[PDB]
Amino acid sequence: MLQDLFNNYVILVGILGLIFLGVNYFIVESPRMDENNGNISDYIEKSGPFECGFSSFNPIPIAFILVALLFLPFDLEVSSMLPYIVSIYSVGIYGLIIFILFLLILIVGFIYEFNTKSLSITTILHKKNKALVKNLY
Amino acid sequence: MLFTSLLLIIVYGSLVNKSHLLTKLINRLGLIIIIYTLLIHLNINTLENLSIGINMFNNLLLINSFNNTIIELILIICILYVLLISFNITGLSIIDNLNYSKRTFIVIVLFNIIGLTLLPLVNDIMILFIIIELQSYSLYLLTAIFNESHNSTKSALYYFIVGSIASFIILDATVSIYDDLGLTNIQYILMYIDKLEIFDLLCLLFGLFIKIGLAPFYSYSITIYSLSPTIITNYISLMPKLSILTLIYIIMHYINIVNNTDLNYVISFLILISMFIGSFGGLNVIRIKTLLAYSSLLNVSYMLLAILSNSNESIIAYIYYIIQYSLTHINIFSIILVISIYLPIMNNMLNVMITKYSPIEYINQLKNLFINNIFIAIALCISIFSLIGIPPLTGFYGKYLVLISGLNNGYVLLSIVLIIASSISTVYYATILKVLSFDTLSFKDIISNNLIINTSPENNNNEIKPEISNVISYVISSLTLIILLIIIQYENIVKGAYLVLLYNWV
Amino acid sequence: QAQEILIKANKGNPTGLTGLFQHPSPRPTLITLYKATLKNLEEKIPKESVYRTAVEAFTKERLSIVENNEIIEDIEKKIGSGLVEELIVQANEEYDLIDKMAEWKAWEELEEKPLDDQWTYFGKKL
Amino acid sequence: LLASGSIGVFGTVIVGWMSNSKYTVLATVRTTAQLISYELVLTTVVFIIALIVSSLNINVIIESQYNIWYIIPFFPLCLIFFISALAETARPPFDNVEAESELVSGHMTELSASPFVI
Amino acid sequence: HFRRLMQYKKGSARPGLAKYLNLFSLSKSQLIGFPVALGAFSFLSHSFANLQEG
Amino acid sequence: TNPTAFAQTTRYVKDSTEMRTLVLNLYRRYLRHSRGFVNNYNLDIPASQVRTKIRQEFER
Amino acid sequence: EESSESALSKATKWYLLSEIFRGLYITLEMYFRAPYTIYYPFEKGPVSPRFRGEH
Amino acid sequence: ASTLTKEDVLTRSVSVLRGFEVKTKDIDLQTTFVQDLGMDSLDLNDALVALEEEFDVVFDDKTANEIKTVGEVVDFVLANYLPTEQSINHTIR
Amino acid sequence: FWPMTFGLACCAVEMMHVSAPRYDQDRLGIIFRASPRQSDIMIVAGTVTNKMAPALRQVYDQMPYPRWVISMGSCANGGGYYHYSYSVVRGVDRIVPVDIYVPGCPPTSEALMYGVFQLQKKMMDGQTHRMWYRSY
Amino acid sequence: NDFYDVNDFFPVQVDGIESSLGKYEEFAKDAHEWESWNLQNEDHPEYPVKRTKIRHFTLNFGPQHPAAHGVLRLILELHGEEILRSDPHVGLLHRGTEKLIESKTYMQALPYFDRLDYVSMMTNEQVFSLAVEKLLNLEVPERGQYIRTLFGEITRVLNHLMSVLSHAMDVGALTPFLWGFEEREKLMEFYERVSGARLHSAYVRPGGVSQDLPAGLLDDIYMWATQFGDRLDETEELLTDSRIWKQRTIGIGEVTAEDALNYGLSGVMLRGSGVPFDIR
Ligand SMILES: CCCCCCCCCCCCCCCCCC(=O)OC[C@H](COP(=O)(O)OCCN)OC(=O)CCCCCCCCCCCCCCCCC
Ligand SMILES: CCCCCCCCCCCCCCCCCC(=O)OC[C@H](COP(=O)(O)OCCN)OC(=O)CCCCCCCCCCCCCCCCC
Ligand SMILES: CCCCCCCCCCCC(=O)OC[C@H](COP(=O)(O)OCC[N+](C)(C)C)OC(=O)CCCCCCCCCCC
Ligand code: SF4
């Protein structure tokens, strides 16, 4: 109850954010002071990418993309258990049995991803070997 | 029965190795699961005891003798459908190995069957918006089952986007009704049927109209059906209409309590346009799946005329129509999946590219079917003739009963248009029949060992080796004679339609 | 005649040295390949080529010692050229050389004669 | 408290985005796939504690540990919480976001002066 | 008409946006042709109704 | 071991005519990458200039 | 089937981080030892009579 | 699809050929390259590469020593013209 | 004082031994930063070959102002042992401006610290904001 | 080619395409607009797909990386996170030592060898001292060869501390790096007492050593030996049995003994593969 004190805190952090932005624009010495060689926009050499010194010119695997997609179901499962947390008492045994069913259905989803090895990054593009066999004629 | 064994198949599916023999046998277990569901359902559900309507699960689901029949219809069509993947259709491994590669094909079907059957039974908006998603998602997953294909994936992406828009339209209407009344259960809303904004139920139907592909939303359904593999299009072009046309009928039953004149005109505007587009659309097309996609739009147009009229003759007309069009749709797509073995082979012109997903794609690939397999062609001709409406095939009574309900309620304009669109459509059903037989005698003397079926080795050259599988040929034969010989049992079957009740009582 | 001799296996028990799996049935397979070596000499390499005489001086010696000894350990110890798996490699790659050496005709006269100054280092003759 | 944690997760993935592509965008699919996954384990641990007190109020959670400290019954959770606490903040050993030997300065190789301080 | 004009400049190198905007691309005369026709239809319809009492 | 992009085995060619055709293809390869050399190295000279200099190199 | 430590014994070491906690403790030993650091330029490191420096 | 026809290649081919030192300004299908235009190795390569830059078709090593007329190049482009694959944004939206 | 780990040659061993527990550069507030953006100093230690000199200029030009360069060892100062080599820059001062030269081969770990201290004594003599008031 | 690139089902002969309102050719000049009239399916393996050869992500593990022990432009071509091809670019430190030695005497060429490996000094100059001794046909006396054996070992400890701990540091274990570097400071004291300079000890000259051991050096060398024995133990505490250290290294970079010989590997990366060969 009564969040006026929290509201002022939210305002203060927002105001404090601009102070992080603005303090640099005032404290730093101007370009002419250090070497004057050029502005940030003009100094393309400095205002450029870093590639260990030498100039150069994310197709991520299926698993990494598959782990991210599977986060959406499992996160909705966990975030839908919130109603049971604040009402674990009143729903009594009936809620507890329903709750376990609501997980056992989702365990089958957990079981299914376990067997197919969908999470593993997998290494099929390489690491192949063969046994040398003489072919006498 | 579905829920208990679907989880068993999901766990068992990944435990065994990925082999087309183990996948096919697992597909048969899908057939056994569906068969048991039908026996268990028929055992406990009867038309006599469901006439009143029996609330279930805290009044979330309500089942009566009308929704009960469609559930039995949905299960039976699925049994015939799974025979397409649980058994060989052609026999040649090249074209049949597409049905055995994906293990989760049957699992996704069983996910959709649970969604299909529960959708007509929804009695609350909270469970309506859920059950429509359980069915809708199962369609998008099904359309993308073959992820190596480029067309199948692009079909599902196009299907996902439009289906999500339809879901949002459906969701928005239910929220609007909730905002006016504050109630959720449909039976509670029926008390306030005279004080809610009736068009919000129309906005609800506009969402359901998109999912079944009604004009002006027809554009995507034709594109999607013409692109997905023939094994996929057979299921996504028929099943969603079985479980949504029934839901539309139940909502229309509620709406006719007030008998809003403005609402009929708007829906009649869509019905009138659909017959135009569904008839003139297929005149200039070269693809067989695009033609049947336009045929589906026109036969959805005919059924919606019965639903809009919504009287005691509509139940008789809609129940009979939905059953007969379903078997005929199964019969045609069963034949098109089998007559792919007579295709010629080159040894070029137009550089026509035929992929293993849709071996039969153009209408002119049915040439000389009267020569190659005359009995199959007659089955195809009979199925085509039913859609035309040649009496006494099952198709004729479908239009006869729709016209009775349409004219009984004063839909004189739509009835005359439905007939004209029936005559216009006959042009592009006769084209299929022209392709099959009209050149039989000019090609009676032909030298051709260049068929796909001729690739198989000769096993013994003495024993008689049938060209087609046993099960798939028997389904075509069983469905062909049902359409042709319905005249015998029509009076009794229509009596079975009299007993179907949706709060008629007395 | 279409035959197949297992040179090195691709699975099983390690043999200390990495990437060198234990050969399933080495002893007769060593005897077979050793015998096939002597057949190759009789078809390709001339008599006076001391390379031909040098192959038999140890192929017959080893192959005879393999047959008498029935323990895998005793085959290595008396031959004294490492493991049994390695002994397969030594016999196999030597067999190929008999094919290649005959192709080169390395029994003939010096093909290319060096110039006068080529092999003299800093003026003083080596 | 958990919702504000999610915003900072989304705040970090902005760092390696569209500012060329040398080292920040290499550690942004890597970063995002890390603090997404452990945000599941961190979130579950919090809810299990809140399940024991049946409250989502931190004061109630603190005041309900008078006779017992949840380090005693829930010792595994404290390890799991701390492991997830480390990975969410990207601190080592789970420090492949700014993998110094692999990605120079990681995602902060472009950042300098005030953007680095913040 | 103005709304679709704004879409052309959002992206034009894309064939798809230009393709379907051509379907809905009313001409200059059609912008007067239709409101005149639809307007004249409603005036002529009612005007003949009054004399014919229905 | 896997050799890098645009690699060729070092071979002592024993034909006068084959070397003529090898060179001719090579000169086209430089001209094909004329646009790239400008964009890769950010050269101040346009694409036609590089081809002009490459031609001055090959003519020489 | 040929492992000396039973399944429970290996699981407890695995789940309870036995070696990491030992690794932490040994590091904590060095926290109570005198650092080697000297204070330049107030102190210098050792030099030898053979040191090679400024010509 | 391949929208280039034979005339379209022929019409735009001359403009590139009008941009290089050619003995005669009359060039059609029958016109040669080495003979009519007096082009040697290095001279002819620039024009052949130039048509690669406009017609966007790559000529291989097999045809290198087998090019003798300008009609062949015009007909070659049609047999070897494809539109570059468009990203998911351009294709469907 | 955050230099950049630009160790190139045998001089780089001494630059590590300053961070070692005996000397502990960290006590003085010295934390090496790999990226040029985060590093305000650049201790060029070791031979600067011709093959490296163009790359060295790219690394130097990316340091935001203010920036200092320390040349440690003989190779970085004037060529050192390899002064007469066909592929050795004879003194890095041909490429980047230098603020202090540490002599040695390699300079002892204290010699680098002494070179760091002298440069620190220069930085404390900076008069930029007074220069605006009085010299500008 | 260089800039871009371009079956199971039967090749099916279908000709005579017709619609219900004419033939294929009657409406051919109009069907390009009709996307449902196209005759080129997109799933066909022979369907013409012309895609430019966009090069794979080639990160530069370049000179300005702490992992680099110098200036190494390691051009790594990777798809995703796996390693496809690696082409190290050595030469960024080619000082031309082999060219300079040809113009300097045998005594003046010794200090060049301490600058080859920054950490293993007295072993480097030992191989040139042995080379000259072999040619000179003169043999170092006994006490000379014992000093080279003792400082041969101390150098190996100095080198391996740089090798193992930086390898541990590059993985991420910062602490063992600093524990060992104090020992290097303690070991470099021994170098400075005998030769004068901490690192580059031009001590092992052809024909023995430079100067005799200072008195009491053995006492200080031995005293370090007793204390040093524990230093390995703590190093093995945070590395040897740690599960994170095992995961990072076990099964990483597998080199067969037969294949190690093919590339001419020697040292630890030849006994790591099982070959029990040692030059000593
Ligand atoms: C005696 C018994 C006989 C029974 C049948 C009697 C009625 C038959 C009616 C036929 C009369 C028109 C047909 C012939 C006229 C030619 C039409 C035509 O070709 O298009 C002309 C015009 C564009 O001109 P153009 O494309 O250049 O064609 C030149 C051809 N000389 O393009 C146009 O003008 C097209 C006009 C726009 C289309 C309007 C469509 C509205 C609906 C028309 C009826 C369709 C049925 C609707 C209800 C069923 C479906 C719901
Ligand atoms: C700018 C205003 C936009 C209004 C949009 C209205 C939306 C709903 C339209 C209902 C029909 C849905 C059709 C799908 C959207 C229509 C797309 C469209 O309007 O584009 C125009 C289209 C292409 O025209 P085109 O000549 O090829 O290109 C001109 C370029 N300068 O030309 C067409 O082909 C469109 C016409 C499609 C055919 C519709 C016919 C419906 C039935 C009408 C007759 C009724 C039948 C019964 C009649 C007797 C009973 C009363
Ligand atoms: C009921 C019991 C409840 C216990 C709850 C706690 C469980 C914690 C995780 C146990 C499993 C595990 O750490 O596993 C180790 C995993 C996976 O190892 P793996 O892929 O299986 O390889 C091992 C294969 N084996 C079985 C053959 C050996 O990787 C790791 O090294 C993770 C290192 C985590 C370091 C975190 C440091 C934080 C310190 C916090 C205090 C300062
Ligand atoms: S100055 Fe001496 S120690 Fe430093 S890099 Fe050069 S040779 Fe090595």
PDB file of C-alpha atoms and ligand atoms in Angstrom, chain I residues 9-11 46-47 73-75 82 104-106, chain J residues 115 200, ligand 4:
ATOM      1  CA  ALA I   9      58.677 -10.722 -28.791  1.00  0.00           C
ATOM      2  CA  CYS I  10      60.992 -11.590 -25.910  1.00  0.00           C
ATOM      3  CA  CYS I  11      60.289  -8.175 -24.381  1.00  0.00           C
ATOM      4  CA  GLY I  46      59.215  -6.471 -29.083  1.00  0.00           C
ATOM      5  CA  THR I  47      60.367  -6.298 -32.666  1.00  0.00           C
ATOM      6  CA  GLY I  73      63.253  -2.654 -25.238  1.00  0.00           C
ATOM      7  CA  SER I  74      65.809  -2.117 -27.963  1.00  0.00           C
ATOM      8  CA  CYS I  75      63.743  -3.436 -30.880  1.00  0.00           C
ATOM      9  CA  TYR I  82      67.787  -6.760 -35.883  1.00  0.00           C
ATOM     10  CA  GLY I 104      67.083  -2.855 -22.205  1.00  0.00           C
ATOM     11  CA  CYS I 105      67.281  -6.285 -23.777  1.00  0.00           C
ATOM     12  CA  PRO I 106      64.885  -7.033 -22.256  1.00  0.00           C
TER      13      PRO I 106
ATOM     14  CA  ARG J 115      65.920 -14.504 -28.655  1.00  0.00           C
ATOM     15  CA  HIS J 200      68.692 -13.579 -22.172  1.00  0.00           C
TER      16      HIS J 200
HETATM   17  S1  SF4 K   4      64.868  -5.650 -27.392  1.00  0.00           S
HETATM   18 FE1  SF4 K   4      65.854  -7.647 -26.894  1.00  0.00          FE
HETATM   19  S2  SF4 K   4      64.391  -8.656 -25.456  1.00  0.00           S
HETATM   20 FE2  SF4 K   4      63.239  -6.971 -26.479  1.00  0.00          FE
HETATM   21  S3  SF4 K   4      62.241  -7.958 -28.278  1.00  0.00           S
HETATM   22 FE3  SF4 K   4      64.238  -7.123 -29.019  1.00  0.00          FE
HETATM   23  S4  SF4 K   4      65.690  -8.872 -28.815  1.00  0.00           S
HETATM   24 FE4  SF4 K   4      63.858  -9.395 -27.549  1.00  0.00          FE
END
